[PDB]
Amino acid sequence: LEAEKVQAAHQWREDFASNEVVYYNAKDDEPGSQRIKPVFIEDANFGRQISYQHAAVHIPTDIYEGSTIVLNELNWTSALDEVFKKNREEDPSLLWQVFGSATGLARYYPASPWVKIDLYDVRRRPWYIQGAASPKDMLILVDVSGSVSGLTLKLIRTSVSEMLETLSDDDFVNVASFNSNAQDVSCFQHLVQANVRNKKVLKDAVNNITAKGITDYKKGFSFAFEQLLNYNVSRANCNKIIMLFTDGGEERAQEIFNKYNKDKKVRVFTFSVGQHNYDRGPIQWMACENKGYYYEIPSIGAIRINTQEYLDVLGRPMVLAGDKAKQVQWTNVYLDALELGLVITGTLPVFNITGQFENKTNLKNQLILGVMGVDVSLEDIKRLTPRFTLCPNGYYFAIDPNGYVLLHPNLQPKPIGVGIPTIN
């Protein structure tokens, strides 16, 4: 509530960088930006050196600071440090309080230095994707026709394997492929959950596809819609999306999009992958008539930034819901990025409400500014359930509405395995 009122009262400074916005970049040891040097005392609640005077900022290596978009966000996300500095006093047990902005920069509370190559993006974290949109039923369509062979198929196998990493256990996924015949790439044959084990089977069968044959968009799209109408299997009953990976074509498949998607219940996101010379006009039409989006992935460096922006389209119905969409959501148990063990994270998306009373909203105010999270350590949840009074054989345990344990004397701070280890 103090990150939405402040942003609404923000004046867009385009080249006022001479005002010298001041912050503390986490990964350091500039025109328009100063740099704070903290004291960095060492705390026992954390395992690192933390200062309680300001909030650190993480800017990804691929995101250039000192930009008009970035410098504006480091200016209006500066009143947070006053309410960041206020949540702690009531409950001195507060862990990392973080605002994951949509630009890519997070500003966490415990001013603490960041952890070889730093491939961290706040927009891909499970606690951000969970609060950026509702669950989904994504079905991935892969073009394995002849024209995608070579480098294009290499970027497609990586793009499909990189979007699967943007899926939680509340979402259901399945990957198909069409080469004038529509078939699944794996043994599943319907929509399966997106847990760790099922996601490895799908991304291992993707790495074994070969490009050969003519292309048939109509036959591959009937297989997509007909797999989203199953309702025999367990599904999410939420955002139904079809993500088509291809290069280009000359068929719009108007008949198929009216036999199935007449009421526009299924969103179609179309990706044009690779460097080629093909008509992308028909591809953009599918993403416009169906309420989706059109993306281009010309190289490997565009895979990470283009496979996560489909969540700005799925969050449009959530923004317009209003205060009914402000529900705290706790994520699965995961290892903290800043080496704090096993933690769970709260979540509350923030909205763009500039020009709320004066009617100029819904111009760009259909997108979220960012997702705010707060970490609870499992060693804290283990302190409200004392064990030294029952017996050596007695214990507590708790599970999600998924079966996964949140607290149990068999869960160790180490990742779970999915298959035998291989190394070349």
Binding site: I420, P421, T422, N424
Partner: peptide, 6 residues
């Protein structure tokens, strides 16, 4: 697990 090769 021991680092099994491929």
């Amino acid at each position: 697990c021991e680092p099994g090769a491929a």
